[PDB]
Amino acid sequence: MFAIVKTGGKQYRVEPGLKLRVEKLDAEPGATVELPVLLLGGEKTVVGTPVVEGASVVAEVLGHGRGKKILVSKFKAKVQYRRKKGHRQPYTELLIKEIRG
Amino acid sequence: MKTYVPKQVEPRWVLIDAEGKTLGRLATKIATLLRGKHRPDWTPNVAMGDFVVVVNADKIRVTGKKLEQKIYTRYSGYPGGLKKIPLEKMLATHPERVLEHAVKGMLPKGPLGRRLFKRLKVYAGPDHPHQAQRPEKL
Amino acid sequence: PRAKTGVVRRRKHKKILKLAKGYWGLRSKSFRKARETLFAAGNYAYAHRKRRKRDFRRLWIVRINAACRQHGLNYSTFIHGLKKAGIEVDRKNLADLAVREPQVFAELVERAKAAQG
Amino acid sequence: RGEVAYSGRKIWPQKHTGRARHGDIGAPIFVGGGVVFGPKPRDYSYTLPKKVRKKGLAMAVADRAREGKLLLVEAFAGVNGKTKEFLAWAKEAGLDGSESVLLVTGNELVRRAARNLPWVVTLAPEGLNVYDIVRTERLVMDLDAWEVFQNRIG
Amino acid sequence: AKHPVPKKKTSKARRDARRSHHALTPPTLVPCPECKAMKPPHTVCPECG
Amino acid sequence: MEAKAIARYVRISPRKVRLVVDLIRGKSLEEARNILRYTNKRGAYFVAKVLESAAANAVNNHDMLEDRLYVKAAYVDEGPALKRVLPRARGRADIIKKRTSHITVILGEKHGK
Amino acid sequence: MKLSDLRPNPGANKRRKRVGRGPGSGHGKTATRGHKGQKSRSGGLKDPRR
RNA sequence: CCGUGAGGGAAAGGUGAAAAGAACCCCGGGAGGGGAGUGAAAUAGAGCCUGAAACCGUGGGCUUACAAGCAGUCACGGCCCCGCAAGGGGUUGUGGCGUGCCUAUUGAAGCAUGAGCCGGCGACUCACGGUCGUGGGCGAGCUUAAGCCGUUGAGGCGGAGG
RNA sequence: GGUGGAGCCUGGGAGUGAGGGCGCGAGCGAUAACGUCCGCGUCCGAGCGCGGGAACAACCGAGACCGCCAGCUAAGGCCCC
RNA sequence: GGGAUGACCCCAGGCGGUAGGGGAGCGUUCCCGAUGCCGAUGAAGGCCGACCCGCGAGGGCGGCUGGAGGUAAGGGAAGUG
Ligand SMILES: [Mg+2]
Ligand SMILES: [Mg+2]
Ligand SMILES: [Mg+2]
Ligand SMILES: [Mg+2]
Ligand SMILES: [Mg+2]
Ligand SMILES: [Mg+2]
Ligand SMILES: [Mg+2]
Ligand SMILES: [Mg+2]
Ligand SMILES: [Mg+2]
Ligand SMILES: [Mg+2]
Ligand SMILES: [Mg+2]
Ligand SMILES: [Mg+2]
Ligand SMILES: [Mg+2]
Ligand SMILES: [Mg+2]
Ligand SMILES: [Mg+2]
Ligand SMILES: [Mg+2]
Ligand SMILES: [Mg+2]
Ligand SMILES: [Mg+2]
Ligand SMILES: [Mg+2]
Ligand SMILES: [Mg+2]
Ligand SMILES: [Mg+2]
Ligand SMILES: [Mg+2]
Ligand SMILES: [Mg+2]
Ligand SMILES: [Mg+2]
Ligand SMILES: [Mg+2]
Ligand SMILES: [Mg+2]
Ligand SMILES: [Mg+2]
Ligand SMILES: [Mg+2]
Ligand SMILES: [Mg+2]
Ligand SMILES: [Mg+2]
Ligand SMILES: [Mg+2]
Ligand SMILES: [Mg+2]
Ligand SMILES: [Mg+2]
Ligand SMILES: [Mg+2]
Ligand SMILES: [Mg+2]
Ligand SMILES: [Mg+2]
Ligand SMILES: [Mg+2]
Ligand SMILES: [Mg+2]
Ligand SMILES: [Mg+2]
Ligand SMILES: [Mg+2]
Ligand SMILES: [Mg+2]
Ligand SMILES: [Mg+2]
Ligand SMILES: [Mg+2]
Ligand SMILES: [Mg+2]
Ligand SMILES: [Mg+2]
Ligand SMILES: [Mg+2]
Ligand SMILES: [Mg+2]
Ligand SMILES: [Mg+2]
Ligand SMILES: [Mg+2]
Ligand SMILES: [Mg+2]
Ligand SMILES: [Mg+2]
Ligand SMILES: [Mg+2]
Ligand SMILES: [Mg+2]
Ligand SMILES: [Mg+2]
Ligand SMILES: [Mg+2]
Ligand SMILES: [Mg+2]
Ligand SMILES: [Mg+2]
Ligand SMILES: [Mg+2]
Ligand SMILES: [Mg+2]
Ligand SMILES: [Mg+2]
Ligand SMILES: [Mg+2]
Ligand SMILES: [Mg+2]
Ligand SMILES: [Mg+2]
Ligand SMILES: [Mg+2]
Ligand SMILES: [Mg+2]
Ligand SMILES: [Mg+2]
Ligand SMILES: [Mg+2]
Ligand SMILES: [Mg+2]
Ligand SMILES: [Mg+2]
Ligand SMILES: [Mg+2]
Ligand SMILES: [Mg+2]
Ligand SMILES: [Mg+2]
Ligand SMILES: [Mg+2]
Ligand SMILES: [Mg+2]
Ligand SMILES: [Mg+2]
Ligand SMILES: [Mg+2]
Ligand SMILES: [Mg+2]
Ligand SMILES: [Mg+2]
To answer: What is the superkingdom listed in this entry's lineage (chain F)?
Structure first.
């Protein structure tokens, strides 16, 4: 019994009781946001249109994050050109509780 | 959400007749089956393939003048070492091999590409080794 | 007052060889071959990140194009089902549908085989 | 490379030796050769505008005054300098020596009393300088000094 | 003839691979039919020939 | 319990001697003894002297019972090399390294319940 | 005023263009002399005011 | 030490608080080591403080004999380790992708220069003038040089001059 | 009309003063040259960073701040590699 | 814009780059801070780290080694990478 939901510009397949790492968003931890956006019910025939309406999935912000740092580097030969920049991409963690029609 | 990847699958066999199929026309699919690019679980590195068997290999047919005009070429190492074999000569010498070649060329290159071609067993005329299942596409 | 090199050059050179662990031959054992090796890995990893995104989509597609070729159609046409069929929802990411949840997929074929047609 | 002990001789012929190319060995590129652009004796003195030195003296006192840290005194009586005697007059004057003091007086014997205290620095009044004011928490002068401090400035 | 010279330094890999044949073979010995000790065949035992 | 003996500063080139060392690693003392006698290398002598000093060391100081021991570990390291000038044609003058070994034999007792 | 809080104004001991030194400062390698010929050379040019 | 000579001309410092510098015993011709002993410490044992890197070796885990390569990178998997866990570290099988660094050039992987590797040494300074800017001081003015007085690293005076 | 990493003025600091390919217009050449010399554009230079052109500075596509296992397209493609 | 006078939050735009210009920082040796403070319950230096802070140069922290030094905030000066 699953869903298909949209956040941060991606689709993810969510379940009751699923810790899902998602693009950072505005909430203080512990708050709840139904994301009024839901694309697919997992009991089938509810599918379609951008979003099957009235539905939503209730999930709770477990707190925000910064992922393992990416060292992203640029080198250009014979031009004496190098650049280093460190990057860790912010995220928020979620627990997917309830599928609401 | 991480993409699904298959654990070790059931190595399903297949059967093809070839008689009166064209060649590169017939070959195209033999590749896609060897690959297993037709299975929803398709994976580039693993080779979840089919094991494709072909019979009546003498009996493939092709258009144009190709039976006379089309030449096969083999370098050895040595000066004057290029050998040139016209299609028809091949057919009466080692039939198949022509299909074997058409497919091997259509398979990828590398260690895995080399494995898949092992998984194509091509026989001349009817019959074959009788082990597995083999549903027949025509 | 003079400031001779002392400890600076050793430390810098170490920063780098640490990054180079695992590399073949001198490329892991020598500050020059380490540094040269790294630049390479640097531009690669970057570029291969862009290319990872490309890499996956092409996998997704083959899988789809294969699976609805059991249900008898083009990938090419399939997507023009959903363009019009409003089922503009996606995918192509999911594709676990095609594998894991087939009749969910099949239903999506149907919603797609009738689109303004 | 000019002043280093070695000879002026060309170390190698300069072609066909298959080696690199070289002059005398006082060359800075050689271990043990000359130093490039390193230090020579030099004079770091300059001249501050005298008006700036007046002002700074004023300002720096004033700041000690504005903190209440300044104290004038008449005459001591912790004189005939022995630092036993000083440490009394000082205690009576509310100087714990929890705060570093600068003591300015023209009295030889008072000066030489204090010198040895870990928290006291000491000067004649002509010796007055903003550096010594600022390192020290409290400033203390007698009037013989304070006068000339004024007759200094103006 | 001019003067061949190695063009690259041999990697530690290619020299150690060279040496893959250099190991010795322990000498071949029989128990001496007179004395207790070990000896090489078709030879006079260093103790009591 | 194990016992070892090291000969330091042997004037021998490690590559040369490391060779016979590999010939005894792991063998019981009785054969290693037999192996070096009938092995033909200048290195065979030297390795034997260390081998023995380690057996001696074992049974005396370490109370280890001479008939139960084998060669547990053995290895040779490269001690400081001796540089001499080698006069060469056309005034040339090379330098040969007369090299130096640190031989280590380590003995242990065969489990031998 | 303590010796700690003394310090100069935000202009005032500007300090200082030295390179020289790395890529990344800019002023690497050629050290702003820019490749070239006589001007790049050590005693460089000929007195441009004339 | 090199040069007939004038002359050239180096390398090379550190046990420990104290020699208490390892009696004696064992292997050995010696060297060397193993015990014992000394010491707070002996991988501080005289080839002696710290003891980096290239370099050489022993042991262990992963890997490798139908594959092709600037040696990396991106993905999945396998075996090994660390953590309750989701997770992390090692390794590399296959798959995608991929023309070393510097320098000089219109143009270089370039079959164009330089570099065997590692460590240390190695190149935009300083004086006096100048010209812009900037932080402050004083402003129809500004400012002293030599020198003279005085000083726990004390500052003042000095108006020639500019 | 046009608010633009536009314009003008005074000043401080430069680097450059070997260019090259392509298109169009001419000259020299042979209605030769990856030839040479000017003009107007362009790109490489410095975008040997990305996509296409098998591979390839300068031809087609497009001006790469960083991340994503999301979407639409450009050139060029949709039998298999 | 908001009136905090900024250092903070929202909005919107730019951010390929060689010669070269401008701008902020990091690190090294030394001086004032210092008759102070850290330190044998372990200085500097060395070896690991999958940990925290920083865009980065860097800084932290932990463990092992090492055995007598080190030296804040804030400034000054150079034989400074
Ligand atoms: Mg390149
Ligand atoms: Mg270039
Ligand atoms: Mg230096
Ligand atoms: Mg894209
Ligand atoms: Mg001289
Ligand atoms: Mg001399
Ligand atoms: Mg001389
Ligand atoms: Mg001289
Ligand atoms: Mg001369
Ligand atoms: Mg040479
Ligand atoms: Mg010398
Ligand atoms: Mg000198
Ligand atoms: Mg000859
Ligand atoms: Mg020959
Ligand atoms: Mg000879
Ligand atoms: Mg001679
Ligand atoms: Mg040699
Ligand atoms: Mg620059
Ligand atoms: Mg600049
Ligand atoms: Mg310049
Ligand atoms: Mg140059
Ligand atoms: Mg030029
Ligand atoms: Mg000149
Ligand atoms: Mg002589
Ligand atoms: Mg001593
Ligand atoms: Mg002895
Ligand atoms: Mg003791
Ligand atoms: Mg010992
Ligand atoms: Mg130690
Ligand atoms: Mg020690
Ligand atoms: Mg030594
Ligand atoms: Mg000491
Ligand atoms: Mg030592
Ligand atoms: Mg080492
Ligand atoms: Mg090994
Ligand atoms: Mg084969
Ligand atoms: Mg194999
Ligand atoms: Mg690969
Ligand atoms: Mg070069
Ligand atoms: Mg050149
Ligand atoms: Mg040239
Ligand atoms: Mg040229
Ligand atoms: Mg080259
Ligand atoms: Mg080459
Ligand atoms: Mg040249
Ligand atoms: Mg060069
Ligand atoms: Mg060469
Ligand atoms: Mg050489
Ligand atoms: Mg170096
Ligand atoms: Mg000047
Ligand atoms: Mg100036
Ligand atoms: Mg000025
Ligand atoms: Mg002014
Ligand atoms: Mg005046
Ligand atoms: Mg402009
Ligand atoms: Mg200008
Ligand atoms: Mg010109
Ligand atoms: Mg021109
Ligand atoms: Mg045209
Ligand atoms: Mg032309
Ligand atoms: Mg031309
Ligand atoms: Mg042009
Ligand atoms: Mg250029
Ligand atoms: Mg451009
Ligand atoms: Mg290229
Ligand atoms: Mg291409
Ligand atoms: Mg291509
Ligand atoms: Mg391009
Ligand atoms: Mg194509
Ligand atoms: Mg922005
Ligand atoms: Mg941009
Ligand atoms: Mg930029
Ligand atoms: Mg010093
Ligand atoms: Mg304490
Ligand atoms: Mg220090
Ligand atoms: Mg430490
Ligand atoms: Mg300790
Ligand atoms: Mg220097």
So the answer is: Bacteria
Q: Is the CB of C22 under 7 A from strand H?
A: yes
The number of beta carbons lying within 10 Å of the beta carbon of residue D93 is 13
Q: Give the count of Cβ contacts less than 8 A between chain A and G.
A: 6
CA distance A38 to A96: 13
**Strand H proximal to B104 Cβ, under 7 A:** no
Technique of determination: X-ray
Q: Is D132 at the interface with chain G, CB within 8 A? A: no
| DSSP track, A53-100 | TT-EEEEEEEEEEEPSPEEEEEEETTTTEEEEEEE--EEEEEEEEEEE
Resolution in Å equals 3.0
According to DSSP, the residues that pair with B121 across neighbouring strands are B53
Please say whether the beta carbons of B33 and B13 come within 8 A.
no
Q: Which nucleotides of J are covered by protein (CB under 7 A)?
A: 17-25, 27-30, 32-33, 35, 45-51, 53-58, 73-81
Does residue B62 contact residue B22 with C-beta atoms inside 8 Å?
Answer: yes
Protein-covered nucleotides on strand H (Cβ within 7 A):
7-11, 26-28, 30-35, 47, 52-59, 66-68, 70-77, 86, 88, 90-98, 100-105, 108-109, 116-127, 133-138, 142-145, 150-152, 154-159
> Which residues partner with E39 through β-bridges?
E30
Q: State in Å: Cα C44 to ligand 68 middle.
A: 18
**Dihedral in degrees, nearest 10, Cα atoms C3, C5, C8, C13:** 160
| Cα angle: C102, vertex C107, C109; to 5 degrees | 90
Distance of CA F43 to CAs C38, C95, F12, F49, F52, Å? 45, 69, 8, 10, 14
The nucleotide lying nearest A78 (C-alpha to C1') is H102
Beta strands in D39-125 (DSSP E): 70-73, 101-104, 120-123
Q: Kind of pairing, strands B13-16 and B51-54?
A: parallel
> Is the Cα torsion angle D96, D98, D99, D105 positive or negative in sign?
positive
Q: Strands F94-109 and F69-86, how do they pair?
A: antiparallel
Tokens standing for residue A69: 């740092």
Helices (H) and strands (E) in chain D, counts: 5, 4
* Residues 6 or more apart whose Cβ sits within 8 Å of residue B11: B49, B51
Specify the DSSP element, H or E, that contains F79.
strand F69-86
β-strand pairing of B120-122 with B51-54: parallel
Beta-carbon-side half-sphere exposure of residue B123 (alpha carbons within 13 Å): 13
Q: CATH: 3.30.365.10, 3.30.70.1150, 3.90.470.10, 3.90.980.10. Which one for F2-110?
A: 3.90.470.10
Q: What is the dihedral of CA F14, F17, F22, F23, to 10 degrees?
A: 170
In 3-state terms, what secondary structure has residue B106?
helix
